[PDB]
Design a binder for this molecule. Structure first.
Ligand SMILES: [Mg+2]
Ligand SMILES: [Mg+2]
Ligand SMILES: [Mg+2]
Ligand SMILES: [Mg+2]
Ligand SMILES: [Mg+2]
Ligand SMILES: [Mg+2]
Ligand SMILES: [Mg+2]
Ligand SMILES: [Mg+2]
Ligand SMILES: [Mg+2]
Lengths: 83, 114, 99, 100, 127, 152
RNA sequence: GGUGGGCACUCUAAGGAGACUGCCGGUGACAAACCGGAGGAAGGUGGGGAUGACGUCAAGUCAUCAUGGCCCUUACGGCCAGGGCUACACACGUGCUACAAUGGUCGGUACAAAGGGUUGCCAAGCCGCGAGGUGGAGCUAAUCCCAUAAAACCGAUCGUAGUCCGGAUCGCAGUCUGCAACUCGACUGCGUGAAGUCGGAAUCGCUAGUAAUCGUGAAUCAGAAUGUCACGGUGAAUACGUU
């Protein structure tokens, strides 16, 4: 895990796109390519479509998984099954 | 006697058994309520066994440990997280090899078709 | 009382330079104590020789650095300072201290 | 070892060398304990907005003659195999085959 | 007075001084027993001295550097043998027959390319 | 080999007892280059033998060795059509090594506290011949006797 | 060796002597040469390394490089962000750790070689269980740092029990570099604690400082070695012989 000298980590464009989304409530999913972003507790309730590699998978965030990275919930390997 | 602690052994050696205390925190408990580590637990007066019970009950052991581990694991599968998703398959979650040599988390060989 | 250090890749040239500086310093009357061979520095390299997969075919190469130390007593004439082109020619490095 | 690969890694070299101090300043700000979150967050934003292709971790040193990434000896500037040619020709000073 | 000797064995070196005295036997400014702890070093060291029945007549002061405990013991043995034969130059044949003057020459063989140790090799599956 | 040029380096490094056979037993019992451990194990077994038997352990060890040294052994031979075993007498030198190897191998697997009393028990057993090593030596001998039809 | 000092010794590195069947006995076609002995530190090309003949396998490499052709020109040429090469019902090769008492822990204690360091090493004190943090000395290095070798010895304990063995897996919280450790790094603290009782057919390495076993360093490199290359400590057994 990241050293505690830097708690959060969000790309600046993502911040300025979601810091707008706090004054006005959740109204539209945010299309995101940054998988390294750390979700802060004060954006709970929004829908974020994270880039899988082909399409953007949308996810909803609540307080339970605040301590996790964005792309952690978006897998990239299919594995439909050997048989 | 805790939860059926063994006798005829050194205090800390038997104190490793309470399922939540190893050897370091076991020695910490032994030195907190000062008793001889080299003394056999059989020759231990009951006037300190109650203090050892207090020390054990301070943090956790057996049942509470089961509860906490299982609740922690349960909030992983439901969340849709990658760690829980792999934890739902028997595959290792830290990121070891899977092309081969993932045996401790797949049990027997279970050969193809037979 | 000055101290002189000599570095070279090849021992023959450093020996020639040490003899030259000893002769120049002694011939003017200034006293000189004998040279000190400092331990050499050997660096080794193991390199693959095939353009493609042959792991056991390898070459070993070595670079050797030789160091010599000199010191003088009773400094009266300093001509070797102006004889730098004489002292060093192509591959010997000379350092001087406590002039 | 294309021409484009050499040109575009020269790009990394140029960009990294051109700043060469602002990274040190921002890392001094961050690493210093008594800096306060007020003077740490602005440094974080400064580091983030600065172009990504100006970092030491973004540089891969290649042969100065062909640009082969693997088989590099930083004692020289040469690749795995041109070292052998130069040594055999006798261009590398002080280098001989060793047995010991 | 005194006599000097040098002994080397397996990258270990030892300087020995043999003087008139009662055999104080100091190893690196320490007693012989206090240096070698529960091993065969003591008697193999004293072997040349006990063979010439002159254990105490010669005080021995040595310094040993490099190698290991067995190598140091061998170096001391060779050095004191040299020091003795620098005093009694009629027992040369005695220590030839004893085999104490000939220096050991075996040294740690180097590692080679394609091998793990000096001579060990990988398994070489035939397929 | 094919030359018969290999030398025979002589090792005799008994520290205090000054015994030759003891030295070869040391070399046999030593494992992974641990000479000191072998010294302590063998000397503990020897001291147990002393504190048990009033006889000096030197001769007890010697008579145990001489009661486990075989005289003939069976060796396979490729006749070119059958699997045959022929009895051959032991070389005078080889029997000592055979006895040492058998003794140490059988002593390694007692299951009691340590090899001190393990080797002590084996030396006492083979002093008069109630040990498993002597039994297996007799079994080898009876192989050789039951295959005497070849002999040669 | 802290200082004066010494050129005694070790040590460092340059130049040199020494081993050439040289001498003796025996054999041998009184040849070549063979078997012992003296002296000798070393005796029979002393030990190790580099050195690979004419050619073979249309062996490998067009992806290190060069190069005769053939191929694309809005792309089979370029730029950027994410993902993969680290996937997983299985099989194979090469290693590491084990299955313990020739050992696991605890306390104090002894001896090596080799090497790297000024876009570097990075000490002292102090703060943290720890990984680590402030701090800045000294060093362009036989001077300062990396950095305290381990196995070994002694004393206490464990008593053969899947165990004071073994450590995978897993849960929680950390530390370091890097813009960024989810896919996908290495280490740290607590806890759980698995398979594993020496392994079939078959199969591998090794002739003396060798096998076995214990530790140390370098390269690549912001970080990432159970791999590669290199250095020492302890230290064996066996060779009747050529079917
Ligand atoms: Mg090109
Ligand atoms: Mg890189
Ligand atoms: Mg060497
Ligand atoms: Mg080794
Ligand atoms: Mg095979
Ligand atoms: Mg072909
Ligand atoms: Mg091909
Ligand atoms: Mg791959
Ligand atoms: Mg051979």
């Amino acid at each position: 895990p990241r050293s505690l000298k830097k708690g959060p980590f969000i790309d600046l464009h993502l911040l300025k796109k979601v810091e707008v989304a706090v004054e006005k409530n959740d109204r539209k999913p945010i299309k995101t390519w940054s998988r390294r972003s750390m979700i802060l507790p004060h954006m709970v309730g929004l829908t974020i479509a994270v880039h899988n590699g082909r399409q953007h998978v949308p996810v909803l965030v609540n307080e339970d998984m605040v301590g996790h990275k964005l792309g952690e919930f978006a897998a990239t390997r299919t594995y439909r099954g050997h048989a | 006697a805790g939860v059926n602690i063994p006798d005829n052994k050194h205090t800390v050696i038997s104190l490793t058994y309470i399922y939540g205390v190893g050897r370091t925190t076991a020695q910490s408990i032994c030195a907190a309520t000062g008793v001889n580590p080299a003394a056999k637990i059989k020759d231990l007066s009951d006037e300190q066994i109650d203090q050892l019970r207090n020390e054990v009950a301070k943090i956790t052991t057996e049942g509470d440990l089961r509860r906490e581990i299982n609740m922690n694991i349960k909030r992983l599968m439901d969340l849709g997280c990658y760690r829980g998703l792999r934890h739902r398959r028997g595959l290792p979650v830290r990121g070891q090899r899977t092309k081969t040599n993932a045996r401790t988390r797949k049990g027997p060989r279970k050969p193809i078709r037979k | 009382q000055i101290r002189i250090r000599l570095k070279a890749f090849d021992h023959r040239l450093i020996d020639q330079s040490t003899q030259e500086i000893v002769e120049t310093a002694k011939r003017t009357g200034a006293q000189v104590r004998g040279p000190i061979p400092l331990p050499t520095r050997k660096e080794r390299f193991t390199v693959l020789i095939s353009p493609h997969v042959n792991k056991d075919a390898r070459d070993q190469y070595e670079i050797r650095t030789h160091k010599r130390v000199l010191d003088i007593v009773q400094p009266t004439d300093k001509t070797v300072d102006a004889l730098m082109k004489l002292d060093l020619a192509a591959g010997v490095e000379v350092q001087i201290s406590l002039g | 070892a294309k021409e484009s690969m050499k040109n575009r890694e020269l790009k990394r070299q140029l960009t990294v060398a051109k700043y060469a101090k602002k990274r040190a300043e921002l890392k001094a700000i961050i690493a210093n304990p008594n800096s306060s979150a007020e003077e740490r967050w602005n440094a974080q934003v400064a580091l983030q907005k600065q172009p990504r292709d100006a970092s030491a971790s973004r540089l891969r040193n290649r042969c100065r003659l062909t640009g082969r990434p693997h088989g590099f000896y930083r004692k020289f500037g040469l690749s795995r195999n041109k070292l052998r040619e130069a040594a055999m020709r006798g261009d590398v000073p002080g280098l001989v085959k060793a047995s010991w | 007075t005194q006599n000097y000797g040098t002994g080397r064995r397996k990258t270990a070196t030892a300087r020995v001084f043999l003087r008139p005295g009662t055999g104080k036997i100091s190893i690196n400014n320490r007693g012989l027993d206090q240096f070698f702890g529960r091993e065969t070093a003591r008697m193999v060291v004293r072997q040349p001295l006990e063979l010439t029945e002159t254990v105490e007549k010669f005080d021995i002061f040595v310094t040993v550097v490099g190698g290991g405990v067995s190598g140091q013991a061998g170096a001391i043995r060779h050095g004191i043998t040299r020091a003795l034969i620098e005093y009694d130059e009629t027992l040369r044949s005695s220590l030839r027959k004893a085999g104490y003057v000939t220096r050991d020459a075996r040294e740690v063989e180097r590692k080679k390319v394609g091998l793990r140790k000096a001579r060990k090799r990988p398994q070489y599956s035939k397929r | 080999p094919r030359r018969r040029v290999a030398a025979k380096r002589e090792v005799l490094a008994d520290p205090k007892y000054g015994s030759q056979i003891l030295a070869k037993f040391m070399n046999h019992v030593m494992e992974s280059g641990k000479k000191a451990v072998a010294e302590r194990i063998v000397y503990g077994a020897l001291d147990k033998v002393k504190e048990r038997g009033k006889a000096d352990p030197l001769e007890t060890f010697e008579k145990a060795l001489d009661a486990i040294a075989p005289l003939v052994e069976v060796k396979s031979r490729r006749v070119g059509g059958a699997t045959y075993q022929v009895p051959v007498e032991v070389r005078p030198s080889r029997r000592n090594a055979l006895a040492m190897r058998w003794l140490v191998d059988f002593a390694r697997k007692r299951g009691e506290k340590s090899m001190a009393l393990r080797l002590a028990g084996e030396l006492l057993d083979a002093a008069e011949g109630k040990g498993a090593a002597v039994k297996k030596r007799e079994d080898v001998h009876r192989m050789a006797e039951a295959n005497k039809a070849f002999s040669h």
